[PDB]
């Protein structure tokens, strides 16, 4: 009386790394980190005529 | 098969966090160079990461908008330990202007912090919660976390959390504008954090002077004592135990209602190697010292009200027998009275691992220890004083103008006072017997 | 830099405590009791 | 034949299991390493009662292990005698409900008990003819109380003819372990009574009462408590495994102690329990067995058995003894407390004799009976539960996870119905 | 009949212990891989430096 | 029996090819002198019968400065001496010059060289064409070369690693013109091509490789890495091989939409790589991370059609099959409604060897992606704005009328871009 799916929730040993490390994914590739280099090196100076 | 993520925003979290990680690092025997020395498994997984061989990456992400503190560690002894690129730093200081940290400069920072958190969470298998330590009595410290809490809560769902904040002392102060920043953070944090402990600093000032016999302690000494408490509370999740207590089994037995989730904790025993050897330190006397009025890590008098529910943790080689005797001893007591609606307010926990003494520090090594986390009605005293501090200066709108200059609506302060007053009304109500 | 230094100083006790916690510790009566059926010695072969 | 299987839920059942199998192996002689080294010949006659057989001669106890948290089982699966269980046998979860009855019975239990029911089904039906079940779980524990209780619910739904057993501990008012005991306990009793055929209650307070009063042991430890449960709990099954004078199955004691279809709670006691120094001075004799065995300071239950009138008392005398009787002592003992035996049930004690004693004690007996004294336990627990409920304190948890207040009131309704219906017979007269 | 039954105890215990070596062999052997790789690039760091 | 031929035009293509050739020779085991110190080099190299290995290459250009560097540098002995056809004058960003006046006379020589290279091989499977759009000579011979190749051969496939200009960072002024013009010519004659817009790489390099001041030398090395990763399956064994023939049967939903933008990871300089486990599960998450996408087109602004990713390293397929699950479950990236599932995978065995004195360190794991996402329409439209602002009053038009390009020729080009925009919108419209 056990369907195939949901049957992997049983814990056999620490091998669940490859199938259970994503439990709380912290969503997925949604947040933006583009052009966030403003924090490691100094901006190329910008001035006026 | 567990894990947790550590976060700190601002100097106050970093310094203790810098102070704390020696405790965790020293316990498991990982040498400061990060590489295991010389040559019992899965115990280190509780706080560390395995890349295959050698060193480990602490589950921490240090944040701050002022680079002074971060640079110090980044060139110090522990430099090689933390991940090279997880120490995100800002460029302009907050300068205790809370409005600055939440809408003008803080916006550009949370982008990374969310990212850095996300990556670390991914490698965790059974994420149980978070440890967020931030100084409410600071401009950047409160603001950065407050934004961090707001995103995170809407980020993950129903996850449990713990916050070991640091409120400002009632009469002795650090800054002059802190009374404001204390209230605003409360509202943004009241409806987002499940549990947060009360650890106002002065209490440790008196505690150190009363037992440890020190007439001139610096901030570091305070940093160690807080570190142990975290160790005592979270020690169960990684080692063997006769009756384990987990983080997710914490606010199932400490928060009577979804509203009132602010409790204070005290630590004991604390005794040096310079005086301890004259007492057997039997468990009969140890526990009673825990409830003594002057040892509350929160600058408030518990005797001013009834208790809601107390969860007290031991550690060492304590046999379960004594717990029954001590608990029976507490109930018969005459000075401490329990609220009418809570029949029994004790959740007994025991772990075998004894606290590890840090050579050259204050704490010595003893074969007993009990740490408590209790939510009691007395905490209303701290809240009432904060409002009285707050209300006055608003009377002539002193210093209010600057908060206006950062884009904060004038009424933004108006909503704050009601919540405390609204909460202030809440506290007494639960105190009325049926 | 002055406060934090190396001074690095680096589980049988835990195992001993765990084994200690699970011991019956009151033993029992020193048994002289040896197995024999209640109604087997009554009926024996007769000459 | 008429064999039984063991399913333990929650940490208590696990830690409890770790000792029972330690005791059972010693009497029959299973080598922890799983091979046989029995000295006599009778030891292998009925070894099927609690064991199976596979290649190589090893014997695999059929003890189902089920818990919602990983800490307990992996810890037991490595200590002494821990190699007997087949790792392929039984499973456990990874999250845990945390003393929250609702969580362990609706959300986490539902997704996990489906697989476990598979393991119980395969094991039990494989035997020649199943006799019954014995389940050990502490009512006051959240995860143990919730998922474990549900398994009993489904179990009785598929084998309407088999028997079942439960060994329970209820938090005594003096010593408490979790401030949230009332909610899960009150909910728990409602589900247990309707289906649980026999429900044994042992009070943590008494165990500490036993150790510090008779044994004179200076400092106890959890280890001592598990044996005391182990000594008696194994006692009620030995006569099912060895030939003797009067052998009684798990069903017979059911027949001779439960008067009606609803009252199914008994209190047990073991003897003799003697201090280290008093062993040689104490006299192993017939009068001492019965006299102490009815002593108040021996029953492992918080209730004082003198508070009411016994309904029926069942004993399983063990060891080779004469047969004029303790019965005459039982006959003599029956009258000597005339006011304490309810009149409308004459001949209110049963006797049974088996001929294989436990290792050490040349003569011993186990007590079991139904008494009106248990009325106090539920009364005090009833008083505690009503306290927290009027104010809805802590009520957010159970209400916020798919449950509604209506159910909680019912738990009060049935429990009051049970208790209110338990003292009526006490005042009943012929 | 017992003779053939007892003839396997030696086979399985030796075999499982025989297999158990593979459990310890791979773990100790695998650690040699990264160490060479992890130690490999320190020269790169010095070479990079 | 499987080989490939490379065609290059323009300085950017020349430099990228040079870098990819250092990478390729060093990986396969050919010393700089060409004398080797089983038959795996056939896929790219041709046997001399006795002696060195003759590289499979043919170069074109109209400015002799860069090429002349080749014939005096460290790789003088590598390529054929008559295969480096080099002209006299440079187009100088005048796309008209490169497609009607100076390139027309040179088209003959390139065709002959191409035919000669084809003759030697007996198992040709495809072509690789490199070119920079925003260049006078670059694009000019790019279009005519593709036209002639298609007309002469037929159905044989073609892959091109083109480079349009960044949204804000640019090196020319007329690049919006030659870029938009290049689109029309290439649309009907290029099968599969990957955007590698310049701007992104600096961000990619600057954040991770930990270099304050990267130069084009740093930039080029990576693209060689992408080509090597995509090609290594054809030349070495794999648990599930991928053949260049099996790309635009799986990454081109219709004959029109065939632009797929790729990304690489992990791209991590060695100063800090060894502080993380580079877990197979975590390596693939960075694959779809927007920050590392080599083209300045947010994947979050649109759905996904199908990304063909070829693993490379020691991945155990059991791991890979799990990895897809987390990404599909993620609600950040949603695939088009009509697409069943847009993943095809390949597994290789050898690790990436590190070019000497380089920045990128060697790791046991590596995965490269080639994905065609509907959002790619962002780049086409954005260049449309600048082209409209230009042609609104025809600044710089007057130098294309006399070169031989009819005035109307610019008009229809605009219509093609609008047609592509409408096609993207419609195909993205769900049923
Ligand atoms: N207990 C304790 N508190 C500290 C220590 N250092 C700073 N604080 C508290 O921190 C508050 C000010 O904030 P900071 O610690 O400087 O850091 P912050 O909260 O991020 O805000 P900033 O002050 O702008 O840095 C003060 O009111 C102090 O009460 C310390 O060493 N020990
Ligand atoms: N990837 C890469 N592209 C480059 C580099 N240098 C120049 N480019 C590209 O080249 C374009 C300019 O044309 P060039 O490549 O210099 O010259 P061309 O392709 O031969 O065409 P003409 O300029 O007419 O001679 C610019 O738009 C850049 O995109 C480089 O170092 N790396
Ligand atoms: N006899 C005995 N009882 C125990 C032991 N540990 C815990 N208990 C009892 O179990 C109760 C707690 O149950 P708990 O473990 O939380 O249940 P769970 O949540 O299902 O695991 C307490 O009231 C204790 O009285 C032990 O080692 N021996
Ligand atoms: Mg500051
Ligand atoms: Mg050029």
TrEMBL record, chain A:
<protein>
    <submittedName>
        <fullName>Sperm-tail PG-rich repeat protein</fullName>
    </submittedName>
</protein>
Automatic annotation (TrEMBL), chain C:
<protein>
    <submittedName>
        <fullName>Uncharacterized protein</fullName>
    </submittedName>
</protein>
From TrEMBL, chain E:
<protein>
    <recommendedName>
        <fullName>Cilia- and flagella-associated protein 53</fullName>
    </recommendedName>
</protein>
<comment type="similarity">
    <text>Belongs to the CFAP53 family.</text>
</comment>
<feature type="region of interest" description="Disordered">
    <location>
        <begin position="37"/>
        <end position="49"/>
    </location>
</feature>
């Amino acid at each position: 009386t056990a369907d195939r799916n949901k049957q992997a929730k049983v814990f056999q040993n620490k091998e669940l790394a490859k199938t259970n490390f994503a439990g709380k994914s912290s969503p997925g590739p949604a947040y933006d980190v583009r052009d966030t280099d403003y924090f490691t090196y100094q901006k190329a100076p910008k001035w006026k005529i | 098969m567990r894990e947790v993520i550590s976060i700190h925003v601002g100097q106050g979290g970093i310094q203790v966090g810098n102070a704390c990680w020696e405790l965790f690092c020293l316990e498991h025997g990982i040498q400061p160079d990060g590489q295991m020395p010389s040559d019992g498994d899965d115990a280190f997984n509780t706080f560390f990461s395995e890349t295959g061989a050698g060193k480990h990456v602490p589950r921490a992400v240090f944040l701050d908008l002022e680079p002074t503190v971060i640079d110090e560690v980044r060139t110090g002894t522990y430099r090689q330990l933390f991940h090279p690129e997880q120490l995100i730093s800002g460029k302009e200081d907050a300068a205790n202007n809370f409005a600055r940290g939440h809408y003008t400069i803080g916006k550009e920072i949370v982008d990374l912090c969310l990212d850095r958190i996300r990556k670390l969470a991914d490698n965790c298998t059974g994420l149980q919660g978070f440890l967020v330590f931030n100084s409410v009595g600071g401009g950047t410290g409160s603001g950065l976390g407050s934004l961090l809490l707001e995103r995170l809560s809407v980020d993950y769902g129903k996850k449990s959390k713990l916050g070991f904040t640091i409120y400002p002392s009632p009469q002795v102060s650090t800054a002059v504008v802190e009374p404001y920043n204390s209230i605003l953070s409360t509202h943004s944090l009241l409806e987002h954090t499940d549990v947060a402990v009360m650890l106002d600093n002065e209490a440790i000032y008196d505690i150190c002077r009363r037992n440890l016999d020190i007439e001139r302690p610096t901030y570091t000494n305070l940093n160690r004592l807080i570190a142990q408490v975290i160790s005592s509370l979270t020690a169960s999740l990684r080692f063997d135990g006769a009756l384990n207590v987990d983080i997710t089994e914490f606010q199932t037995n400490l928060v009577p209602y979804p509203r009132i989730h602010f409790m204070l904790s005290s630590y004991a025993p604390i005794i040096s190697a310079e005086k301890a050897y004259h007492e057997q330190l039997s468990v009969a006397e140890i526990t009673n010292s825990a409830f003594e009025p002057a040892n509350m890590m929160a600058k408030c008098d518990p005797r001013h009200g009834k208790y809601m529910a107390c969860s007290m943790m031991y550690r060492g080689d304590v046999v379960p027998k004594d717990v029954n005797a001590s608990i029976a001893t507490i109930k018969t007591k005459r000075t401490i009275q329990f609220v009418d609606w809570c029949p029994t307010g004790f959740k007994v926990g025991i772990n075998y691992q004894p606290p590890t003494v840090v050579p050259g520090g204050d704490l010595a090594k003893v074969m007993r220890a009990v740490c408590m986390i209790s939510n009691s009605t007395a905490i209303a005293e701290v809240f009432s004083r904060l409002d009285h501090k707050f209300d006055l200066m608003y009377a002539k709108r002193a210093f209010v103008h600057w908060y206006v200059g950062e884009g904060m609506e004038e009424g933004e302060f108006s909503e704050a006072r009601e919540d405390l007053a609204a909460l202030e009304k809440d506290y007494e109500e639960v105190g009325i017997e049926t | 830099a002055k406060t934090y230094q190396g001074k690095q100083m680096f589980p049988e006790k835990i195992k001993a405590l765990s084994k200690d916690l699970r011991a019956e510790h009151f033993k029992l009566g020193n048994d002289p009791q040896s197995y024999t059926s209640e109604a087997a010695a009554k009926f024996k072969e007769f000459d | 034949m008429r064999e039984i299987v063991h399913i333990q839920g929650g940490q208590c059942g696990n830690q409890i299991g770790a000792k029972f199998w330690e005791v059972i192996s010693d009497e029959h002689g299973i080598d922890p390493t799983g091979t046989y080294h029995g000295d006599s010949d009778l030891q292998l006659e009925r070894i099927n009662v609690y064991y199976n057989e596979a290649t190589g001669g090893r014997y695999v106890p059929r003890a189902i292990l089920m818990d919602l948290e990983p800490g307990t089982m992996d810890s037991v699966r490595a200590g002494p005698f821990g190699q007997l269980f087949r790792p392929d046998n039984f499973v456990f979860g990874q999250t845990g409900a945390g003393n929250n009855w609702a969580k362990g019975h609706y959300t986490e239990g539902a997704e996990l008990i489906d697989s476990v029911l598979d393991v119980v089904r395969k094991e039990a039906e494989g035997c020649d003819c199943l006799q019954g079940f014995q389940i050990t779980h502490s009512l006051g524990g959240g995860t143990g109380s919730g998922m474990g209780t549900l398994l009993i619910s489904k179990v009785r739904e598929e084998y309407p003819d088999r028997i079942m057993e439960t060994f329970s501990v209820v938090p005594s008012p003096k010593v408490s372990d979790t401030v949230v005991e009332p909610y899960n306990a009150t909910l728990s009793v409602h589900q247990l009574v309707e289906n649980a055929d026999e429900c044994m209650v042992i009070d943590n307070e008494a165990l500490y009462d036993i150790c510090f009063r008779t044994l004179k042991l200076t400092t106890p430890t959890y280890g001592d408590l598990n044996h005391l449960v182990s000594a008696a709990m194994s006692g009620v099954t030995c006569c099912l495994r060895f030939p003797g004078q009067l052998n009684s199955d798990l069903r017979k004691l059911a027949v001779n102690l439960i008067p009606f279809p609803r009252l199914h709670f008994f209190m047990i006691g073991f003897a003799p329990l003697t201090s280290r120094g008093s062993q040689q001075y104490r006299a192993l004799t017939v009068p001492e067995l019965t006299q102490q065995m009815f002593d108040a300071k021996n029953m492992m239950c918080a209730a004082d058995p003198r508070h009411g009138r016994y309904l029926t008392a069942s004993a399983l005398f063990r060891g080779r003894m004469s047969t004029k009787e303790v019965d005459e002592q039982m006959l003599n003992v029956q009258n000597k407390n005339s006011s304490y035996f309810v009149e409308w049930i004459p001949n209110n004690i049963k006797s049974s004799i088996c001929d294989i004693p436990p290792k050490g004690l040349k003569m011993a007996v186990t007590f079991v009976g139904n008494s009106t004294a248990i009325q106090e336990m539920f009364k005090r627990v009833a008083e505690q539960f009503t306290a927290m409920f009027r104010r809805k304190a802590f009520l957010h948890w159970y209400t916020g996870e798919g449950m509604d207040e209506m159910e909680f009131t019912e738990a009060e309704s049935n429990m009051n119905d049970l208790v209110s219906e338990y003292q009526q017979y006490q005042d009943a007269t012929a | 009949e017992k003779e053939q039954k007892e003839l396997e105890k030696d086979i399985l215990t030796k075999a499982v212990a025989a297999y158990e070596q593979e459990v310890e062999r791979k773990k100790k052997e695998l650690y040699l891989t990264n160490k060479q790789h992890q130690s490999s690039l320190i020269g790169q760091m010095h070479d990079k430096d």
